[PDB]
Amino acid sequence: MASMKTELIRTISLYDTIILHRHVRPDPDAYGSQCGLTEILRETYPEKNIFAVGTPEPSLSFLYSLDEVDNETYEGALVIVCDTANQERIDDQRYPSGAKLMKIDHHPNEDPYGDLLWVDTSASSVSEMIYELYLEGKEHGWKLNTKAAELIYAGIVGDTGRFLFPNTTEKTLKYAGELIQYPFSSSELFNQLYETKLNVVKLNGFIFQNVSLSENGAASVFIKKDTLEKFGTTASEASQLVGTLGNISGIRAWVFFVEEDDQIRVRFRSKGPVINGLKYNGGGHPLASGASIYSWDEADRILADLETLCKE
């Protein structure tokens, strides 16, 4: 809604202090929406006290640095939470202690928190929504500088896997075209987003070398303790590699089994068949899913089922 968009801008003009949140374990969209908006507000309102809080992610610290804020700073503040569907995942829970709370998200509105809410499930990403907000804010004095343009672009390219994912729409590409006119270097941004440690690259090599495809295009990857120790890779590094099998000729759906301290992180992926239906105490989207498990026996039966989902 255009009105709804205007009501956010009006509210932002009104508060002297604005403190911005995002979700725990932030991804590029969280940096681009939260920090992109911070940077628009800093440029536009050099008289306001603007702060972006939370715990940084070291692989994205190159985008922007966060602030360490006192409890007193929230008194009478506007608080803005970006890209966070559930209150319990907001990084830095002090979010409701301001005078006002504003929710800007693209995930379904199951937790309809905020005094003002702007939820658009058709946006690719919350970074796209921030660029659309800025388009409506321009007429009200908003300024997008080079740093902000770079943040928003980074959000959009990280969240869509660089216009690869089904969440890419016409607006995504249009706004990216607009944003790429700012004098930041897109190629050094991509170099940094995609920079990968040699040991993780090696683990990725081990996975490619040993993957096998059934008759039905099903595939599986067991990354056990020993494997992690040998490559010096964390379980989280290993699981983040699940998406690298997607270009294999004839692959339909696959799964990673990563052995953690407490559980075994399971990651599912599919080139077509729906895999949320595969129940095992965890679900997700139709082509990307997750769950936990507690023995290899249980993994072995997930396998039998994957075979079936792929045969059918």
Residue numbers in the entry: -3 to -1, 1 to 275, 278 to 311
From the publication, what sentences describe this entry?
In the Firmicute B. subtilis, the ytqI gene product was shown to be a major nanoRNA turnover enzyme, and was renamed NanoRNase A (NrnA). We show here that Bacillus NrnA is a bidirectional nuclease that can degrade RNA fragments from either the 3′ or the 5′ end. We have determined crystal structures of B. subtilis NrnA in its apo form, as well as complexed with substrates. These structures reveal a dynamic bi-lobed molecule with the DHH catalytic domain and the DHHA1 substrate binding domains connected through an extended linker.
Bacillus NrnA was crystallized in the P21 space group with four molecules per asymmetric unit. The B. subtilis NrnA structure comprises two globular domains connected by a linker region (residues 178–194) that consists of a short α-helix bordered by two loops. The N-terminal DHH catalytic domain adopts a mixed α/β fold featuring a 5-stranded parallel β-sheet at its core. Residues from the DHH motifs come together to form a surface-exposed active site that faces the C-terminal substrate-binding domain. The C-terminal DHHA1 domain of NrnA also adopts an α/β fold with a central mixed β-sheet and helices on both the apical and basal sides. The four NrnA molecules in the P21 asymmetric unit of our crystal structures display variation in the orientation of the C-terminal DHHA1 domain with respect to the DHH domain, and the distances between Cα of H284 (at the end of the GGGH motif) and Cα of H104 (in the DHH active site) can vary from 11.9 to 19.3 Å. NrnA from B. fragilis, M. smegmatis and M. tuberculosis are reported to be dimeric, and Bacillis NrnA in our crystals packs in a similar manner. The dimer interface in Bacillus NrnA covers about 1600 Å2, 11% of the total surface area of the molecule, and is centered around helices α5 and α9. Whether dimerization is a consequence of crystal packing or is the physiologically active entity is unclear. In either case, the NrnA active site directly faces the DHHA1 domain of the same monomer and away from the dimerization interface, indicating the catalytic cycle of an individual nanoRNA occurs within one monomer.
